Amino acid sequence: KFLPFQQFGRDIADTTDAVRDPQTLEILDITPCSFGGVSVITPGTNTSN
């Protein structure tokens, strides 16, 4: 519930998780995407590629 006297929104980490348009008042939350790191599972080079 957004009280109609605030302007911005920031959960934590200075994350400005409230973006609103002057004409219409809507609240929103911002989070980084899923994303993933990688690792290669290789048997012996001399065995197979």
Add this chain to the structure above:
Amino acid sequence: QCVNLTTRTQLPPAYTNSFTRGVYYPDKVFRSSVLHSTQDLFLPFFSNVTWFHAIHVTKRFDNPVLPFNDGVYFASTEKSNIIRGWIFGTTLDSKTQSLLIVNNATNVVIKVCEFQFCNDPFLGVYYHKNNKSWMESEFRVYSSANNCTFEYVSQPFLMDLEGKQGNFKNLREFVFKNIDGYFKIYSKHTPINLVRDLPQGFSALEPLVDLPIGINITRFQTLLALHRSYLTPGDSSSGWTAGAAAYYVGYLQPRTFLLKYNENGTITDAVDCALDPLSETKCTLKSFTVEK
């Protein structure tokens, strides 16, 4: 030009502690169900403030001014609209500008001009028997005003004026701030009807209007609508006629505090960061509950 109408009788001031009142959102940013730490001019949970009772018909006449001193936390419980507005200025003359706010059943007027201030300013309201109504016709508070700067007129923001007989069943809480040439303004309304003076509840104030005014201010005062009394020549009464009212004032201070939200997103509880050792701990670790 001006008329001096002062009473030799005087009364010493009276103090009163702030139970728990005074908290708001330090910034217009929004959060929810999380605890954050900020730093802005706030009201310490357990702080002492002063009361003001100006009711002259036993009888007592005392309407002094209050220095500004870096922000003011105002409040009152008026019912008949005894307090109309206030003024500013270090010299209380035409050499400096001032802010005038008058609210009525028609509109709300916020005039910023250099109104001349008399020795004992006070509003005057008459009573027309033929009309069976009370209005205002004496406006000798200011001799004249020039160099108009700002003027805002709009409908009554939060003035109900519906109940014909309201016996102290309302509470008004605002906050006036001045920094960097901006005289910010707030507005908060929590209805209350209790035999006591202050409640044990909790709430926060919200901004009202952002009127940027650049001028040094260190002393401000309000005005009172002294009603007219019909007295015959043989009466020779005191000549002063007014209602009953008493406004509530506080003070601002810079400090770090922790405010707590809820599922809805509205502040429900908070703990001062420097009130006592126990509270310091709640700020320090993460939250309110601490194990042995």
